[PDB]
Amino acid sequence: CPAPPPGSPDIRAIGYYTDAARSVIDPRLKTQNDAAVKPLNAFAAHVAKFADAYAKGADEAAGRCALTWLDAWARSGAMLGRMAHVNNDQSDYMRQWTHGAAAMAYLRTQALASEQQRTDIETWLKRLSAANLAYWDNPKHKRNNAYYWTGVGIMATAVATRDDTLLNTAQGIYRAGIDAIEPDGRLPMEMARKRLALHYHDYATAPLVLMAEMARLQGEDWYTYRQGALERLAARVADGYRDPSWFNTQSGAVQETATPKASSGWVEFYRLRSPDPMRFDAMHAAGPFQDPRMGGNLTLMAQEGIVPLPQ
Numbered sequence: 001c002p003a004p005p006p007g008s009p010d011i012r013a014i015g016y017y018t019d020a021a022r023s024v025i026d027p028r029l030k031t032q033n034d035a036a037v038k039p040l041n042a043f044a045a046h047v048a049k050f051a052d053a054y055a056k057g058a059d060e061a062a063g064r065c066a067l068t069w070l071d072a073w074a075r076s077g078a079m080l081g082r083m084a085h086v087n088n089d090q091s092d093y094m095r096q097w098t099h100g101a102a103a104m105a106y107l108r109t110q111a112l113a114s115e116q117q118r119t120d121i122e123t124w125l126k127r128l129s130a131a132n133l134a135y136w137d138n139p140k141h142k143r144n145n146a147y148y149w150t151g152v153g154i155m156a157t158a159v160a161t162r163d164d165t166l167l168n169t170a171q172g173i174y175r176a177g178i179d180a181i182e183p184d185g186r187l188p189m190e191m192a193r194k195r196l197a198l199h200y201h202d203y204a205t206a207p208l209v210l211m212a213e214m215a216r217l218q219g220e221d222w223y224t225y226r227q228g229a230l231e232r233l234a235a236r237v238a239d240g241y242r243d244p245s246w247f248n249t250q251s252g253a254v255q256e257t258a259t260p261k262a263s264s265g266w267v268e269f270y271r272l273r274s275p276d277p278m279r280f281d282a283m284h285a286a287g288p289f290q291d292p293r294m295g296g297n298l299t300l301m302a303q304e305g306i307v308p309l310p311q
């Protein structure tokens with residue numbers, strides 16, 4: 001188990017969108033944001049890799065390594081300090097995404113935690129939850145897909161610590177996303193993203209599906225909430241990768257040519273749930289899907305279960 005890197009209290013990230021619709025990328029800004037957020041993304045990638053390795057079985061050491069990394073960042077109060085707002089709110093988004101990855105890793109490996117690791121890690125995860133939730137008390141922050149993504153870390157924290165009030169907090173975020181889906185399946189704030197409209201409908205679906213899967217671990221069936229709406233949005237995403245003409249006319253821009261990847265792996269879970277699974281065949285075939293911000297290997301988790309059976 002390699003030594004965990006420093007886990008700084010602060011985050012000073014860099015926005016890289018230049019147009020009001022946030023669909024035009026500034027490459028120098030993006031390359032430079034990649035350097036600023038490197039330790040956060042490397043921490044997320046490593047813990048998810050350890051949790052994946054633990055989930056294969058016969059590799060308890062990998063699970064304990066993830067817990068060693070999570071404890072080190074809990075003990076240094078990683079990401080609980082100052083968030084710089086320069087160009088936009090990329091720092092707050094990094095705290096959200098990285099909290100989710102850390103919380104999913106803990107949820108997947110916590111069966112191996114010592115008592116001290118549980119105290120440290122769970123306290124750190126609940127303070128991250130509170131800080132990420134408080135960011136959205138400002139109504140000037142539009143609750144697009146970044147709000148839904150904030151639910152990931154809150155939800156995984158709630159399940160891992162059996163924290164029912166935090167569970168209900170995540171439920172309100174999931175229900176807000178479902179309630180924003182229009183009868184034709186549009187999410188207006190994602191459809192405002194021009195050539196990235198399809199990309200961001202995909203991106204909005206991913207944390208909603210992952211939260212719904214996690215709710216099953218607490219005996220709740222969030223898929224029935226306004227049953228119909230999630231399927232309508234997910235089917236539009238699948239249709240869009242097959243042929244983008246609906247997103248072209250709805251967004252007013254020819255969609256970027258991108259294939260499904262990373263967080264598109266929500267389809268691995270959702271195809272086992274949909275009233276029309278075959279629509280997701282091409283999306284499935286573009287896998288396997290890995291996203292550290294979603295707990296790691298989504299292809300394997302959809303078939304194994306998010307949490308490995310304890311040894």
Ligand SMILES: O=C(O)[C@H]1O[C@@H](O[C@H]2[C@H](O)[C@H](O)[C@H](O)O[C@@H]2C(=O)O)[C@@H](O)[C@@H](O)[C@@H]1O
Nearest residue numbers: 016017022088089090093144145146200203
């Ligand atoms: O940068 C990433 O790692 C992810 O960015 C996501 O889009 C963000 C984007 O970074 C900006 O913060 C912009 O203001 O808002 C986007 C959002 O709506 O969340 C995704 O594009 C994701 O695919 C990237 O991996």
